[PDB]
């Protein structure tokens, strides 16, 4: 009667039924194992606490993210998380309904083939499909033309689009994402006087950034006002009760997106990459692309990011037209909403890939299925 849409986000997993406006399962992608001897034999010990629980008891586990910068590194962890989400949380058998999967652009074909083979062989799903997060973002936004800023936890990419067609030759993928920002935040927090190394403190710093970070319209002016540090410093309460005061670090780490040179990467910022991508497009569609700029992902919720992007683009672009930035307040789950809407479409009921055709043809079929 319905289908399930699963988004294997680089740092989080979103899943739910096709038709619902909100996901029914939102847990981070953590597959933790005990570090200590395994000494206790009573009430509850399990070889690998992977999943939602892992966050609660992270203090005695070596948390490892199965997916790194959009590409899977450990297949056992991914299969374990898939099994957990399908059974423990959703409690829906794979055979009952099909599954929808999404992945970042410009990914290796090996990952796609392995994922399709595992899905068709292990869980024997009746049918499935592979799509792109940006197109689902367009579907969720209810628009047919624009440029997508899919700045996820692991990968940031853009895909120019036009009415009824796309431009595969103008796709740019940047490895910079939330994980690098967290690493830089840890490094600077070290320069302040607070040290964080293990993965538990990695989660702590991730929460701190999620709660007390914002972008700066002007870097130099903000630094000068920080020189007069009497109205910008803020305090955060650690689990142990210790209080940490954060000043310039609030608006320093986000600036790494516009200044990749801070981490040492010889690349350009998101504004420069979007400008280059739009310039590579045809002249006529440049106006439409400028007039519509959709952004999505968990790395673009920092207040003031839209204003800074607008200012930078207008400064770079000619000052004779109007540039508009659209920032929906629900961009976190835009990909899932788009996937659900696409699945609900009547015309898409035949585009699925079934077991019979997959077995007769082979894993290479998915490669030709909408690129």
């Amino acid at each position: 009667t319905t289908a399930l849409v699963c988004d294997n986000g680089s740092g989080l997993v979103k899943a739910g039924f096709a038709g619902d406006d909100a996901p029914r399962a939102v847990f981070p992608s953590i597959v933790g194992r005990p570090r200590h001897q395994g000494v206790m034999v009573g009430m509850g010990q399990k070889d690998s606490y992977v999943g939602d629980e892992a966050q609660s008891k992270r203090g005695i586990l070596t948390l490892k993210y199965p997916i790194e910068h959009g590409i899977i590194t450990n297949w056992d962890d991914m299969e374990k998380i898939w099994h957990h989400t399908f059974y423990n949380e959703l409690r829906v058998a794979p055979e009952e309904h099909p599954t929808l999967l999404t992945e970042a652009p410009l990914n290796p074909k090996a990952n796609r083939e392995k994922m399709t083979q595992i899905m068709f062989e292990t869980f024997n799903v009746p049918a499935m499909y592979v799509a792109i997060q940006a197109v689902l973002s367009l579907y969720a936004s209810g628009r047919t033309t624009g440029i997508v800023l899919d700045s996820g936890d692991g990968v940031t990419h853009n895909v120019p689009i036009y009415e009824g067609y796309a431009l595969p030759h103008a796709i740019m993928r940047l490895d910079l994402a939330g994980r690098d920002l967290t690493d830089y935040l840890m490094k600077i927090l070290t320069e302040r006087g607070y040290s964080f190394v293990t993965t538990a403190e990695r989660e702590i710093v991730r929460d701190i950034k999620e709660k007390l970070c914002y972008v700066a319209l002007d870097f130099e002016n903000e630094m000068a006002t920080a020189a007069s540090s009497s109205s910008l410093e803020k305090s955060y309460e650690l689990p142990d009760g210790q209080v940490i005061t954060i000043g310039n670090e609030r608006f320093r780490c986000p600036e790494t997106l516009f200044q990749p040179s801070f981490i040492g990467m010889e690349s350009a910022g998101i504004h420069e990459t979007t400008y280059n991508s739009i310039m590579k497009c045809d002249i006529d569609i440049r106006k439409d692309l400028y007039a519509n700029n959709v952004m999505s992902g968990g790395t673009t919720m920092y207040p003031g990011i839209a204003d800074r992007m607008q200012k930078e683009i207008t400064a770079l672009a000619p000052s004779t037209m109007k540039i508009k930035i659209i920032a929906p307040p629900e961009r976190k789950y835009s990909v899932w909403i788009g996937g659900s809407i696409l699945a609900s479409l009547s015309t898409f009921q035949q585009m699925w890939i079934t077991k019979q055709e997959y077995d007769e043809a082979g894993p290479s079929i998915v490669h030709r299925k909408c690129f």
């Binding site: 790194e68 910068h69 959009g70 590409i71 590194t73 490895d175």
Partner: peptide, 7 residues
């Protein structure tokens, strides 16, 4: 990745 970058 296999060559270039880690993943």
């Amino acid at each position: 990745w296999x060559a270039x970058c880690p993943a």
